[PDB]
Design a protein around this ligand. Structure first.
Ligand code: OLC
Ligand code: K
Ligand code: ZN
Ligand code: ZN
Length: 406
């Protein structure tokens, strides 16, 4: 019944489920292009209706949680993801089974896909439900701020371990590919996700029962351009954490799933470089200049990436992907600058209004992005999203530089 015991358990429990989510969410675009090879539109349209279906059901779900005990909301959300991942695997096995019949001409296939995406909605919806029940003020209201700052120091390390490790572990397991079934690797990662959910439910439920009353029983116009220049970066496809690029690298580039996993894992590593560079430039150039020098550094590294992207050789793909990793240092740096600049220009009172406006602009860019992806002719035409991405980054510089004159 020691605090350190409770801490280590929750950490290990999070280690499994965070790796489970990261692995599963990384192999989804892969499984969508073995059922629909050459057709990236499916992957984009899948994520498009998942994003829309989640947004339209977010305020609808809030009314059925606002007056319910946290110990039940956890019971719902966690197991809601469990049955949504399971339903995802079922629809996946059927879609591959129907195409291999086959089988794509029937309207039966379209039904399975809509159902599949609907399942993807429930998984993300159940994820939100679990997050709200666990809340934001529940962690500080449970532990002293001195023992929490030590605890939060471990979370960053563990979340880093999953963001770097799980995509590599996923790409290896997904690369199973036996004679039958060819999606056995996907099913294992899906099972990985399920097994990692049952300690999550218990560890999050036991912490509620342990602390009954400690937590709650129930559950500027010129500042717009600063938001915009950050929201324009949500229009880009050039990211190791991006799903569209991962599908293009697996279908057209025909790169091994494991190296694509490594490529994603190395993305979080360059993110750490920003945690040293961005603070350095702040004390040396200024907060505003550091943001510009990071956003500018992002736009100049992505410029090289597109240049190498036009060559199309075994060496050019190495430079292309490499510059994308190098661009992360600038992105993560500018993204931090985005947050702190708002923390210095907006009081703690009306900070809630700002965060919501950003959640409207950035999400719009997300919808716009996958909408463009849903209008693609083929995976080969994904290149047109690459040039748009760089333009979105270069213009994001223009918008920020214009705003920086203040
Ligand atoms: C909402 C219901 C609209 C009816 C059919 C949509 C089917 C969409 C077909 C998508 C299948 C993609 C392959
Ligand atoms: K999990
Ligand atoms: Zn201490
Ligand atoms: Zn493969």
């Amino acid at each position: 019944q020691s605090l350190l015991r409770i801490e280590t358990q929750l950490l290990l429990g999070r280690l499994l489920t965070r790796s489970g989510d990261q692995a599963w969410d990384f192999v989804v675009p892969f499984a969508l292009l073995v059922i629909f090879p050459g057709k990236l539109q499916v992957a984009a349209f899948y994520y498009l209706i998942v994003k829309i279906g989640t947004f339209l059901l977010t305020p609808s779900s809030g009314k059925w949680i606002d007056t319910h005990p946290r110990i039940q909301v956890v019971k719902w959300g966690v197991w809601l993801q469990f049955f949504a991942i399971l339903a995802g695997m079922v629809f996946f096995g059927m879609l591959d089974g129907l195409v291999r019949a086959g089988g794509r001409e029937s309207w039966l296939l379209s039904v399975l896909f809509i159902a599949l995406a609907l399942s993807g909605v429930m998984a993300s919806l159940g994820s939100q439900i679990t997050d709200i029940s666990v809340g934001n003020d529940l962690a500080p209201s449970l532990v002293a701020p001195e023992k929490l700052t030590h605890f939060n120091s471990w979370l960053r390390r563990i979340d880093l371990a999953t963001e770097v490790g799980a995509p590599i572990l996923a790409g290896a397991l997904f690369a199973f590919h036996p004679e039958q079934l060819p999606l056995a690797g996907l099913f294992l990662i899906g099972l990985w996700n399920l097994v990692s959910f049952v300690p999550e439910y218990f560890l999050l439920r036991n912490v509620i029962q342990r602390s009954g009353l400690k937590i709650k029983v129930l559950t500027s116009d010129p500042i717009f351009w600063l938001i915009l220049s950050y929201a324009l970066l949500w229009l880009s496809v050039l990211s190791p954490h991006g799903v569209l690029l991962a599908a293009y690298l697996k279908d057209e580039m025909r790169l091994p799933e494991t190296e694509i996993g490594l490529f994603r894992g190395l993305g979080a590593v360059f993110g750490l470089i920003s945690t040293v560079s961005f603070p350095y430039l702040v004390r040396r150039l200024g907060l505003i200049s550091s943001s510009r020098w990071h956003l500018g550094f992002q736009g100049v590294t992505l410029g090289i990436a597109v240049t190498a992207f036009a060559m199309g050789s075994t060496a050019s793909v190495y430079v292309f992907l490499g510059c994308i990793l190098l661009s992360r240092v600038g992105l993560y740096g500018f993204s931090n600058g985005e947050f702190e600049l708002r923390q210095r220009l907006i009081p703690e009172g009306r900070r809630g209004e700002l965060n919501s406006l950003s959640s409207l602009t950035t999400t719009s860019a997300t919808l716009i992005l996958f909408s463009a992806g849903s209008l693609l002719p083929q995976t080969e035409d994904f290149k047109y999203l690459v040039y748009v991405s760089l333009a979105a980054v270069l213009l994001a510089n223009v918008v920020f530089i214009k705003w920086s004159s203040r």
